[PDB]
Amino acid sequence: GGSVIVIDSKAAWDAQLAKGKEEHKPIVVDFTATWCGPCKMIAPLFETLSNDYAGKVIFLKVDVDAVAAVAEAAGITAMPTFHVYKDGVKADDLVGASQDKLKALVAKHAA
């Protein structure tokens, strides 16, 4: 929901990373699974932040069930995992469902 873009393929993943690089806007990615309890707890906040920071930060969702190859390439082991991408490459990450830490991560990289 919100302004989150659901990634459905490797091709779409690459295209969004390239757009963030061209637009000079950071990307925050939620790597998630519907069997993961904490993922469902923090997803509403991820979507709220995607609305609050729309225009400043790009928000993507990667369901590891839908795009296993992108999750594997990203080195995910625990969920939820949030990654920040700038200029095509990983710049920061945050693991777990802490609401304060997610708010801080977005504020840091939107600045």
UniProtKB/Swiss-Prot annotation:
Residue(s) at site: Contributes to redox potential value: 37-38
Disulfide bonds: 36-39
Subcellular location: Cytoplasm
Keyword match Lipoprotein: no
GO cellular component: cytoplasm
Active-site residues (renumbered): 36, 39
Pfam family, one: Thioredoxin
Residue(s) at site: Deprotonates C-terminal active site Cys: 30
Every Thioredoxin domain range: 1-111
Function: Participates in various redox reactions through the reversible oxidation of the active center dithiol to a disulfide. The H form is known to activate a number of cytosolic enzymes.
Membership in a protein family: Belongs to the thioredoxin family. Plant H-type subfamily.
Protein name (record): Thioredoxin H-type
Phylogenetic classification of the source organism: Eukaryota, Viridiplantae, Chlorophyta, core chlorophytes, Chlorophyceae
